[PDB]
């Protein structure tokens, strides 16, 4: 399944992942493309932060959805 990722810079990028992918493996995909360490990024959906070791299936995230990519800093 594919989806779109939106950052604070208003950048939109599409990623290919499996519904059984772990928040880790997925972060790895993000790091590989954005080169941003996973320890500096946080992923949130449905107002909830994804926990490490869990699969997407855990979080009813279906195909073609918008994921929120937040950096280490909460904001300005």
UniProtKB/Swiss-Prot annotation:
Residue numbers carrying (Microbial infection) ADP-ribosylthreonine: 66
Q: What is the effect of changing residue 65 to D?
A: Phosphomimetic mutant that binds and activates PRKN
| Location in chain, cross-link Glycyl lysine isopeptide (Lys-Gly) (interchain with G-Cter in ubiquitin) | 6, 11, 27, 29, 33, 48, 63
Q: Where is the Ubiquitin-like domain?
A: 1-76
Q: Residues at site: Interacts with activating enzyme? A: 54, 72
Compartment(s): Cytoplasm; Nucleus; Mitochondrion outer membrane
Instruction: Say which domain of life the source belongs to.
Output: Eukaryota
Modification Phosphoserine, positions: 65
According to the UniProt record, what happens if one changes residue 72 to K? No effect on ADP-ribosylation
The outcome of changing residue 74 to K is: No effect on ADP-ribosylation
Q: How does it sit in the membrane?
A: Peripheral membrane protein
Instruction: Point out the annotated site residues (description: Essential for function).
Output: 68
Q: Cross-link named Glycyl lysine isopeptide (Gly-Lys) (interchain with K-? in acceptor proteins), where?
A: 76
Q: Which residues carry this modification: ADP-ribosylglycine?
A: 76
PTM comment: the record says: Phosphorylated at Ser-65 by PINK1 during mitophagy. Phosphorylated ubiquitin specifically binds and activates parkin (PRKN), triggering mitophagy. Phosphorylation does not affect E1-mediated E2 charging of ubiquitin but affects discharging of E2 enzymes to form polyubiquitin chains. It also affects deubiquitination by deubiquitinase enzymes such as USP30.
What the protein does comes down to:
Exists either covalently attached to another protein, or free (unanchored). When covalently bound, it is conjugated to target proteins via an isopeptide bond either as a monomer (monoubiquitin), a polymer linked via different Lys residues of the ubiquitin (polyubiquitin chains) or a linear polymer linked via the initiator Met of the ubiquitin (linear polyubiquitin chains).
Q: What is this protein called?
A: Ubiquitin
Q: Which organism is it from?
A: Homo sapiens (Human)
Instruction: Please indicate which part of the intact protein appears here, giving the first and last residue numbers and the full length.
Output: 1 to 76 of 229
């Amino acid at each position: 399944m594919q989806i779109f990722v939106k950052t604070l810079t208003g950048k939109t990028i599409t990623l290919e992942v499996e519904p059984s992918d772990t928040i880790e493996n997925v972060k790895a995909k993000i790091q590989d493309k954005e080169g941003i360490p996973p320890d500096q990024q946080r992923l949130i959906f449905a107002g909830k932060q994804l926990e490490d070791g869990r699969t997407l299936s855990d979080y009813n995230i279906q195909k073609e959805s918008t994921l929120h990519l937040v950096l280490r800093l909460r904001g300005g």
